[PDB]
Amino acid sequence: QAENAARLGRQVLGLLPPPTHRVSLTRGPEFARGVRDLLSKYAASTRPTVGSLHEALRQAPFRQPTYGDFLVYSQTFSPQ
Amino acid sequence: IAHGDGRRPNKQRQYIVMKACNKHHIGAEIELAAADIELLFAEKETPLD
Structure with a gap:
C-alpha cells in the first residue's frame, strides 16, 4: 500500500517550482x-x-x- | 610570338583575377507536440503505458 504512497514521493518531488539559484562561493565555478x-x-x-x-x-x-x-446556483449556470 | 612584318613588338603581359565565395543559408522547422515531449519523462506504469 506504500507503493501508492511511493507514487506521491515521485510526483510531488518531481512537480515543484524550480528552486533559487544559490551556490556558496567556496565551491567555485560550479554554478555555471x-x-x-x-x-x-x-x-x-x-x-x-x-x-x-x-x-x-x-x-x-x-x-x-x-x-x-x-x-454558483444551479439555475443560472445551465447544467450542460 | 614575334614576326618579321611592320607590326609593333609585344611586351610581356600579366593578369590578375579576383574571385570570392558566396554564402548560403538553409533552415527547416520541426514541430513536436507538447504531450509527446512530456510523456517521454512520465514514468512506466502498466503494459499499456
Missing part, C-alpha cells in the same frame, strides 16, 4: 554548470536521436495558471 535552460543551441550530429537530445527536451519553460473557484 547549474545553468541549463539558458542554453538554447543544442549540438546536432549526422544521425541525431532521442538519446542525443533527451537532455535537450528536458529544459522547458515554467507555466502554471491560477484557477478560480466559484460556487
